[PDB]
Amino acid sequence: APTIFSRILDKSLPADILYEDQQCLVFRDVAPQAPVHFLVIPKKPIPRISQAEEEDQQLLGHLLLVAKQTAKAEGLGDGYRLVINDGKLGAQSVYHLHIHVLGGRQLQWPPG
Amino acid sequence: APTIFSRILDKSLPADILYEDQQCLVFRDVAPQAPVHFLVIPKKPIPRISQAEEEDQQLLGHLLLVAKQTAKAEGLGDGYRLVINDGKLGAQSVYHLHIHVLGGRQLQWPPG
Numbered sequence: 566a567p568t569i570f571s572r573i574l575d576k577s578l579p580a581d582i583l584y585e586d587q588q589c590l591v592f593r594d595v596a597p598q599a600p601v602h603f604l605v606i607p608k609k610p611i612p613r614i615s616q617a618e619e620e621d622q623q624l625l626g627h628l629l630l631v632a633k634q635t636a637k638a639e640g641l642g643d644g645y646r647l648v649i650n651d652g653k654l655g656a657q658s659v660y661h662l663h664i665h666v667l668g669g670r671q672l673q674w675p676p677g
Numbered sequence: 678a679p680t681i682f683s684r685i686l687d688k689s690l691p692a693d694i695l696y697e698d699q700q701c702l703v704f705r706d707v708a709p710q711a712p713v714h715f716l717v718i719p720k721k722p723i724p725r726i727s728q729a730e731e732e733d734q735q736l737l738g739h740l741l742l743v744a745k746q747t748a749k750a751e752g753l754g755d756g757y758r759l760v761i762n763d764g765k766l767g768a769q770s771v772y773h774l775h776i777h778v779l780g781g782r783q784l785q786w787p788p789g
C-alpha cells in the first residue's frame with residue numbers, strides 16, 4: 566500500500582512540483598543524476614510497469630506526453646532520456662509507477 | 678524520411694521479430710546491451726519522443742503495454758528497464774520513435 570510517493574502526492578512530504586493534473590504528478594528527484602532529473606508519476610497507484618493493464622493504456626501515453634512537454638518547459642531541446650525500471654534487475658526502489666526524465670548533460674550508453 | 682527501421686519494417690533488412698500488430702513492431706537489437714535487448718517501435722513513423730502529439734496518446738501507452746507483455750514472454754520477472762532516448766544529449770541514433778527493453782542481467786544506476 567503506502568510508498569514514499571504517497572507522502573509526495575498527499576503533500577505531507579516536501580517535493581519540488583513542476584506540474585500536476587487529475588491523472589498524474591511531476592516532481593524533481595531529491596537524488597538528481599543530471600542537472601535536470603524529475604519524475605512523472607500517475608495518481609492511480611500502479612506499483613510496477615509490469616503490473617499495468619489495458620485500462621491504463623491512455624494513462625501511460627499521457628505520462629509519456631507529460632514527460633516530453635515537461636522536458637521542453639525545462640529547456641531540454643538538445644536531448645534527454647526517459648527511464649522506467651521494473652523489479653530488482655531493473656534496480657527499482659519506489660514501487661509506484663514513475664517515468665524518470667534526465668537531461669542538461671550527455672547521457673552515455675549503455676544506460677546502466 | 679527513410680531510416681534503418683524503414684528497412685526492418687518493410688522487411689528488406691533482416692531482423693529478429695518477437696511481435697507485430699497494426700500499430701507497432703517488436704524486434705531484437707543487433708547490438709544487445711543485455712542478454713535480452715529488443716526494441717518496441719511504432720508503425721506511424723514519429724521521429725523523436727519530443728515530436729509526439731496528443732493524437733499519439735493511445736499509441737504511446739500501447740507501445741508501453743506491448744513492451745511489458747513482451748518482457749513477460751521473454752521471462753523477465755526478476756526485472757528489466759525501458760529507455761527512450763531523445764536528440765544528441767539523449768544519445769539517439771535511429772530517428773524513429775522506439776522503446777528499448779533491457780533485462781536478464783542487473784542494470785546499474787545511473788542509467789548512463
Ligand SMILES: Nc1nc2c(ncn2[C@H]2C[C@H](O)[C@@H](COP(=O)(O)O)O2)c(=O)[nH]1
Nearest residue numbers: 569593594595596650656657658659660
Ligand atoms: N524528490 C524525491 N525523490 C525521491 C525521494 N525518495 C526517493 N526518491 C527518488 C529517488 C529515485 O531516483 C526514485 C525511485 O526510482 P526507482 O529506483 O526506479 O523506483 O525516487 C524523496 O523523498 N524525494
Ligand SMILES: Nc1nc2c(ncn2[C@H]2C[C@H](O)[C@@H](COP(=O)(O)O)O2)c(=O)[nH]1
Nearest residue numbers: 681705706707708762768769770771772
Ligand atoms: N536489430 C537491429 N538494431 C539496430 C540496427 N541498427 C541500429 N539498431 C539499434 C541499435 C540501437 O540500440 C538502436 C537505436 O537507439 P537510439 O540511439 O536510442 O536511437 O537501434 C539493425 O540493423 N538491426
